[PDB]
């Protein structure tokens, strides 16, 4: 009997080779004697190559391998919300089993050209430095790239928390993170109330390479259920770089020839297949959407590296966080020159699109002129621009941790910045100016905020100027 039963020939480093399995199909799940599950990749003439999805210590030569008849699948359903699971869907938080009754394939085709729609719905993250000059829309994919200890996880968690009052499911996938770090992230989500609509998929650094390679696909497959039911999903991949490292480990264990930086040839395909599946579906397909926020960690801020370039070449824009700016007090550390959003304009409300259109280019020019100005003198217009605008934009784009700011207040603050109302105050006074301006707005100008909330447009021609002048009349300077 070699039709649905096999025998192990070799075991080592998380991969196995089995004899028999005549009728096994490529990509099928297989089960060892211990109950550990496996994946069939290579159907050679005389043997089948199997990747072990779990602890391979208990597997020995001569053990029996039997078919399951199903292509690689994960359990999906509504009951998975609020739980912490592994890439295989097994519960990990210890709160009992999971009552899902449906499965989806890990490898699924992406929506076609005619199944998509242009992105037109803003995704307010609550951060000025994102919502102003790097807008994110529903169905877009936008990676956060930077060095270690720069705030990428903080940005992701704040974005997840900000979606409390909207009907959208959030998925957080941790690839290669410390178990304690994942525990603390889950605790913060529980404290802020995000666990009512969040699914956490974890694969720590102690797990074998196959699970690290498989986890993001499990997360996206989980999101596909809600996307095709007509709902909106946000998915976060925590280290696509660690996924690439695990895939390189697996490929070199399979003795595939290495390319640039010892990565396999299909390293670009690995990421493109995953990231291409997030899309904004059309009305015929139900109008659902899936938003992806992949993460890439650079070395010494080198954006020219192979993996960063590969991931940038796939997504719809990047948010570059700089360590040199993270230090010295610019905590958001947004680098306007290297950042870009390719769905800009359409991913913003009409007011914000009207106000903050040119900010990214303005700060890029300001950084260039600041770099150049170290050598010599400046013209009158250069001195006006560099200091009255760039220095104040850099200061007003700064934001504190866990401080969501409504878009109706953001449009006000960038309008005041752009119209030149901040030129007469010192640079150090702008944060107190912003705080007192928000207080004054809440106290007196609630009707402008209501008009912006209801119409998504600017409130008035001259009443806005009048209100800003009224606030400036009572603001104490220095």
């Amino acid at each position: 009997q070699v039709s649905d039963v096999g025998t192990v020939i070799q075991v080592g480093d998380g991969i196995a080779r089995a004899h028999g399995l005549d009728n096994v199909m490529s990509g099928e799940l297989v089960e060892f004697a211990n109950g550990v599950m496996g994946m069939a990749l290579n159907l050679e003439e005389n043997n089948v190559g199997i990747v072990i999805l779990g602890p391979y210590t208990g597997i020995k030569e001569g053990d029996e391998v039997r078919r399951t008849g199903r292509i690689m699948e994960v359990p999906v359903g509504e009951a998975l919300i609020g739980r912490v699971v592994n890439p295989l869907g097994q519960p990990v938080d210890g709160l009992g089993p999971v009552e899902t009754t449906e499965t989806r394939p890990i490898e699924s085709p992406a929506p076609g050209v005619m199944d998509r729609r242009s992105v037109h719905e803003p995704l307010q993250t609550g951060i000025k430095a994102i919502d102003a000059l790097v807008p994110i829309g529903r169905g877009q994919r936008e990676l956060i790239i930077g060095d270690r200890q720069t705030g990428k996880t903080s940005v992701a968690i704040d974005t997840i928390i900000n979606q409390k009052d909207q009907n959208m499911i959030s998925i957080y996938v941790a690839i290669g993170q410390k178990e304690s770090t994942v525990r603390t992230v889950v605790e913060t989500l529980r404290k802020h109330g995000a666990l009512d609509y969040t699914i956490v998929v974890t694969a720590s650094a102690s797990q074998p390479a196959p699970l690290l390679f498989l986890a993001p696909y499990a997360g996206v497959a989980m999101g596909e259920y809600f996307m095709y039911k007509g709902k909106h999903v946000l998915v976060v991949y925590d280290d696509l770089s660690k996924q690439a490292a695990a895939y390189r480990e697996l490929s070199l264990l399979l003795r595939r020839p290495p390319g640039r930086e010892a990565y396999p040839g299909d390293i670009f395909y690995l990421h493109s297949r995953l990231l291409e599946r997030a899309a904004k579906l059309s009305d015929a397909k139900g109008g659902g959407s899936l938003t992806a926020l992949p993460f890439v960690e650079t070395q010494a801020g080198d954006i020219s590296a192979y993996i960063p370039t590969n991931v940038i070449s796939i997504t719809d824009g990047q948010i570059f966080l700089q360590s040199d700016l993270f230090f010295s007090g610019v905590r958001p550390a947004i680098n306007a020159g290297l950042s870009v959003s390719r769905v800009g304009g359409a991913a913003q409300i009409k007011a914000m699109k009207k106000v903050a259109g040119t900010l990214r280019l303005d700060l890029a020019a300001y950084r260039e002129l600041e770099a150049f100005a170290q050598f010599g003198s400046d013209l009158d217009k250069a001195t006006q621009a560099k200091l009255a605008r760039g220095a104040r934009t850099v200061e007003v784009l700064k934001q504190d941790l866990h401080q969501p700011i409504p878009v109706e207040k953001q449009v006000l603050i960038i309008y005041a910045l752009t119209r030149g109302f901040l030129d007469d105050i010192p640079v150090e006074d702008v944060r107190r100016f912003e705080k007192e301006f928000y207080l004054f707005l809440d106290q007196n100008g609630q009707h402008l905020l209501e008009h912006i909330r209801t119409t998504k447009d600017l409130p008035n021609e001259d009443d806005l100027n009048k209100a800003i002048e009224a606030f400036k009349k009572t603001f104490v300077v220095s």
Binding site: I71, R116, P257, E276, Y306, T309
Partner: protein
Amino acid sequence: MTRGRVIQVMGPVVDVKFENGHLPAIYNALKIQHKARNENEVDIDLTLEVALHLGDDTVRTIAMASTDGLIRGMEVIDTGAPISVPVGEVTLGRVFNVLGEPIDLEGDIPADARRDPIHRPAPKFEELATEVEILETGIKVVDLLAPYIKGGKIGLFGGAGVGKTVLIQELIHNIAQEHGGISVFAGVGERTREGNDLYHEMKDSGVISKTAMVFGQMNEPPGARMRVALTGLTMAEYFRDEQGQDVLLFIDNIFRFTQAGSEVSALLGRMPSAVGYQPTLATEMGQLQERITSTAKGSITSIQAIYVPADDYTDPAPATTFSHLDATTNLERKLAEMGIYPAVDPLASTSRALAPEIVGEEHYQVARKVQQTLQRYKELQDIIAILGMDELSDEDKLVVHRARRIQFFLSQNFHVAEQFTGQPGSYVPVKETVRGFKEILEGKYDHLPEDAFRLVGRIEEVVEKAKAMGV
């Protein structure tokens, strides 16, 4: 009988064993059509292309779709001919995949329509046309330093996220809307969102009435990513030959073809070469590139975007494709970071139309002087950094003063860029560009501020921008 059996399945590569004496020829198309015999199987509908003859009546093939669900032992059908795609007037206004099957939901192509094989030899030496004429694009840098040649081959080099897609869209907007001939777009290994947006924009603008579009994207397997460009080229070749019409050919990313070739090379038994590329990198690229040419019976002008991995211009794929182009524009991440779009490198960009007898001495002298000034400004950077600005001679101070303004004036606002910034954009004639750059070189605009030259059209808009700033 021409019946095959599946022996090995290794990712996107499948080995098929045929009966002795009936092996299919290389590049032939094989079909697998299997219905699930029970609950432990899935339905299969897959096409394969013959790649190698391994001996023992065995053939190694490349799959055009996912190989999941394949069981070794399945039946394979030999069609006896390479992949054939529908061709003719029926392809205008339609969107096709790699196999020539429409994906626009507008209806199926009739089964009796004429079809042409994908693989064909390149045109001979005696059939080539040789005549250089300027193709005006309305872009200042392109029109001044590296003019495009009508009927020639144009390549755009750039890294990840530098702007070559936006440049392609701007060129389509400027040229294709009034070309009068036939336009063909081939999307190789790019974003489905970008493809959908381009299709909808063409439908809105009405250009789609005379445009044939073929799409194989990054989510598709390497076989499709290799053959989609050949399908598009097969359509363009018919439009050139059988009707003698001018053809616009846009290829979204030609680097993905060689990337997929390198990905599939390792499973074909080839030894690695250079940094990991296949040994046949040059011949495979040449066989495809040499088919994109203008002949005596029809002219094809093609604009190709070429991706540069890891921003390394010495990589073999960008390096070997340089010799296949007549005009090239090189984008730079350094210029992109400075905010001066389209970030075309003014020195590395070259073209064969930049000659005194083609563009005139008035144009040629201005272009050469601009290049010389920019080169001197580039050289002065180290001495400026390590000695200060005040230590330069009055000649070098003037050189820097002129060069910064020239570099800023090289930037432009694009029509397709209105979705990113609120500026509407502009179209600048070659005469206006030459006159403006000559006036800047003459020192007429030395009193204006530096930033007044950024993202404007004609030289006048600099004056109005300075007046708005308050000079």
